[PDB]
Amino acid sequence: FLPVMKLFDLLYPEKEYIPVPDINKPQSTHAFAMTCIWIHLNRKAQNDNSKLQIPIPHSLRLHHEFLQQSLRNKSLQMNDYKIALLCNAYSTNSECFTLPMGALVETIYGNGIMRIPLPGTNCMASGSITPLPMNLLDSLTVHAKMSLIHSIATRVIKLAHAKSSVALAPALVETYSRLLVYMEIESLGIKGFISQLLPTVFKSHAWGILHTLLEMFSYRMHHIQPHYRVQLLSHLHTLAAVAQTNQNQLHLCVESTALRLITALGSSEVQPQFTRFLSDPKTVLSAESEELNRALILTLARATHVTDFFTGSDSIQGTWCKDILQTIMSFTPHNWASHTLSCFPGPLQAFFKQNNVPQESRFNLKKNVEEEYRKWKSMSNENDIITHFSMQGSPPLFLCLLWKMLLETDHINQIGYRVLERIGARALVAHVRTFADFLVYEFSTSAGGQQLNKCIEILNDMVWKYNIVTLDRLILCLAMRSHEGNEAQVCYFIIQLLLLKPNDFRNRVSDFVKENSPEHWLQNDWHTKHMNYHKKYPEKLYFEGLAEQVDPPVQIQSPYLPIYFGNVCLRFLPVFDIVIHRFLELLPVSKSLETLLDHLGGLYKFHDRPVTYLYNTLHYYEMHLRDRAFLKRKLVHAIIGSLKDNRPQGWCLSDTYLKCAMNAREENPWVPDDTYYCRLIGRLVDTMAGKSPGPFPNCDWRFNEFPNPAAHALHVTCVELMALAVSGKEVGNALLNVVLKSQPLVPRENITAWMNAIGLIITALPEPYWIVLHDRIVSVIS
């Protein structure tokens, strides 16, 4: 820092005093920064001041006197930016930084100001709900921010290890979610948090800090690096194996996080990330639950056929996929369907000819549950039926006991209430797996009529009137049914009636899409709207609805966990995606997806990455969706109209797509000229370089699903290009007749970028789209 005053003379050669302007702009701290630099040079001159001091400059001493008056000042807040001036001119001090620190830490931590009641019982979260805004988060120095981080860490260590009743304020958890995105602090950020803060929280054994951290990792993070993603995946596997996680919320939150990060995976990182944990493939897999392993297998399936890595081979041997699946098949036997095998890659289909468990017999499945159904009433004592029906190792058959009670009496006694809570949510996935098998097997042979509508409503009785589980788990267990032919269609129609015949969950979805928006960081009162939504619908997560219907009066009053961002709809949207995938895997359940999309299109208001998901959905079923035209047109009728408001105008669609695509079919699709495709290529090539107005709107790319506008443009262009009713045969003809034949609106001395975009498009395109290039090259070589 020696020659910097000469850097003054080239930058600021002046003679007249600098007046003090208005402080209210966040950029004024940039203008007041060099005064703070001089006073921090005096902070450097705090020690060894006998060597070569600098006199105060004539022009800057007016603002130096101003900051000295601010030091004499005893009031600082958001009225001006003197909070930033006193946090930045005195950041390298020992006690001059504590004066703004005392104002800051008592206004967002919630230091016992107010105890807001969260939904549930006995949840006194702290008072403050207004976090540090975006302009405040950038008006501070890095050292002031990291000193604030150290102070916050010293507060939360003694808060977590004491397990105090003082919870963390919504303002401070919002600020905590906001600060971790900045990679300048990442050395002491989440890398310094999973090294320091997370081991101390693990040693604390608090179970509430972990739940809130999981809440702000699932519903508040947007860009986690894949190595950090699998590090957190290992951390949650180490956490869930210990600390008696038999609670419903502890299992449910970690399931909604694991399935989220499974669905947040793409298609290109599957190969380099696996060899990092190739030494330990077992611990990154589910040992007890079929659901997570099947989700990972389908993640592998969508990461290979889309990237077309399987072609040129027809076996799994000699690749990186054989050993991970060898670790998959252990301790989790899972069947596979032929229609599900249809969209699988060739080597994957060849490997699925072995190591595949068959289905269990329906007749014995009903015979055993009926044989112990009469043993339920052979003697009706409490303790013997509680113990005999609920040890770990019993065949999971209890939902049919409950169902045979509520087919004709609608009453669950003390035994039924005690068994379900004694089993715990860790075995509830394995229970509901076989219960979904009961459901599909029972409706396969069911007779239509009054029972068809009665059964779905008494099933909704467990959904919202008994509150046994969150709705997502049962529907996902019904989604992974690997049956052949009629039973798969029957289960799809089970889900079809489950989503529309009861209106309670649809009322909650409507309430959340009307009263909440995905822009959570810009929503300062997100906590207030969450409290209103949870007060409208009382979320019962510990069999509370099941408790009041018990014939003896039995109630649960356990204290709930601190919940700020969790709800059923966000936990169900990945299940809503996997059921859509299962529907599109099978043919004769096509039009049933058509009536659902226009019915339940609002939940995609709150999708973490809807564009990539719809692109993969339309790409993976390329051999399943080209034949069904109106089914392919139906998708743009529902999901695009959902996120057309919060995402700005022109975020996804083109003008002629708004004119002719979502219009209903008339047996005459608009076969376009090549200039329509040239418009899309011109959209792509300008967004690759980027423009200040931009054809596509700018957004907070830190909190998006794309870190760059180029990735945002590529995905939407890939969505719109291959969503037409025409198959992947004429698409290549049009793409080449743009370039192989002459074209208007396409200029030279730029065509390299155009053909680069076309090449990336056609490599992102499915197999028949670019297999026609071989037939093209045959003609020109001959």
Binding site: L740, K741, S742, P744
Partner: protein, 119 residues
């Protein structure tokens, strides 16, 4: 290309004594010579920007190229080689098809009737 830019108002013999001498300096086949003669005429037609310069360049490529070729036939065999020159010339599909977007029609018919008019 330099002649039709600004100094296209001269006589027909300066360009002749330039280009025929160019064939003296570098070994150039006469079919390749006529191939260049016609592809320069096409390029100066299409690559000329729209405006009065388009009209000037098209007139330069249409009205002075018969004058030089009549004198070349007078001073020189010149019937057989231009057939192989057109054998070369009738393969340039995309660049000359890009000219037909601007010209909205088939210029080949007009030019191959113009050559017949020149005999």
């Amino acid at each position: 290309l330099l002649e039709g830019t600004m100094n296209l108002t001269g006589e027909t013999q300066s360009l002749v004594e330039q280009l025929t001498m160019v064939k003296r300096m570098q070994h150039i086949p006469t079919p390749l010579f006529v191939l260049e003669i016609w592809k320069a005429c096409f390029v100066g037609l299409i690559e000329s920007p729209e405006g009065t310069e388009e009209l000037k360049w098209t007139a330069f490529t249409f009205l002075k190229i018969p004058q030089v070729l009549v004198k070349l036939k007078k001073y020189s065999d010149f019937t057989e080689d231009v057939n192989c020159a057109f054998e070369f010339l009738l393969k340039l599909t995309p660049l000359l098809d890009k000219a037909d977007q601007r010209c909205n029609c088939d210029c080949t018919n007009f030019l191959l009737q113009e050559c017949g008019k020149q005999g």
